[PDB]
């Protein structure tokens, strides 16, 4: 009984993590990534306890300790007055409650740590997938350059515009939010004038029509920011935050060339898997960035999918892909819905609804425990 050889399309967090996770449990997995080399851009992400646990399982948490940063609190700030509307301490309480720390870190750092632990030799650069056809015993991936690679299982981790998803279920439009995210890492030495940044904090500035998130990365030496605005040029971004507190305007004014990303997600899908092909990460369940969980969820996907594929033979692959999907879909669906809800919530004008939002924010540790406190390993059979 042959154990499956596994081809993974995409070398982002999701693809690296699942390849790394498969190999750690004795399955041969190989990544096909379209880019000629992996980027060192892409700014900051937040790793919750739930994702931290996935990184421990995959053996990469120890390598990320240095470049991680440990926000002491989540501080929800009024757009105009700069007052702390709601605050929750993370130092100690977060780890005690949910079983692991809250980290903020560069995307690229997480990507690099995964790449190293997996081994770069397991990643084919320059391989752009254009398609996947199911065979009788497995599947074969088509590349742009005419190539092919057959396998006992194929995992589509090729992002929100997944070639693998298109092949399996046909054309499907990504859903535009009507907002853009501007993202940047600002060196802290360009922000000496901003005294709030003396403490490491997860900042969430909430206001009318738009919002602004900031946090430290690289052990406190740079500050990530994400500015979500109705929909790139720095002048138009600075203007969209006219009237806001100096903290926001000063941080925006310290980056000449921020990155702009139209923010899309997709409707939840009833089906991810077809014979020996399945999806993972943004390809399976793309969400807006408003829970800070997309990477976290790709990591959960990776752990769970590696578990099922490490325990089967070639003939058990379809069943294993369906078991992964059946466990992962409901959770990701709720996060998708939640991330949409939060886009609205973060952008209310001043008024009763915003005051009611603020009230429900007081009970946030209970209300999001299902996310941060989730034990991925304990969810398995
Ligand atoms: C502004 C913003 C802020 C965010 N903040 C957070 C946060 O705080 N916390 C969090 O957990 N998540 C966050 N996310 C979400 C997170 O970045 C993603 O969910 C996560 O990186 C998705 O990883 P992935 O591997 O599924 O996909 P991607 O990172 O999209 O990787 C896909 C890979 O596949 C490759 N590829 C694509 N098509 C092909 C092809 N046809 N053939 C071969 N290779 C291909 C790409 O080159 C890429 O390397 C944020 C997202 C945004 C937009
Ligand atoms: Cl996200």
Numbering used by the authors: 3 to 233, 245 to 394
What did the article's authors report about this structure?
Here, we elucidate the biosynthesis of the antibiotic 3,7-dihydroxytropolone in Actinobacteria by in vitro pathway reconstitution using paa catabolic enzymes as well as dedicated downstream tailoring enzymes, including a thioesterase (TrlF) and two flavoprotein monooxygenases (TrlCD and TrlE). We furthermore mechanistically and structurally characterize the multifunctional key enzyme TrlE, which mediates an unanticipated ipso-substitution involving a hydroxylation and subsequent decarboxylation of the CoA-freed side chain, followed by ring oxidation to afford tropolone. Based on sequence comparison and phylogenetic analysis, TrlE belongs to the group A FPMOs that typically feature a mobile flavin cofactor with distinctive “OUT” and “IN” conformations, enabling flavin reduction (in the presence of the native substrate) and substrate hydroxylation, respectively. While the biosynthesis of unmodified 4 from 3 in Gram-negative bacteria has been recently linked to the action of the non-canonical flavoprotein dioxygenase TdaE that structurally resembles acyl-CoA dehydrogenases, herein we describe a structurally and functionally unrelated group A FPMO TrlE from Gram-positive Actinobacteria with GR-2 type Rossmann fold as key enzyme for 4 formation.
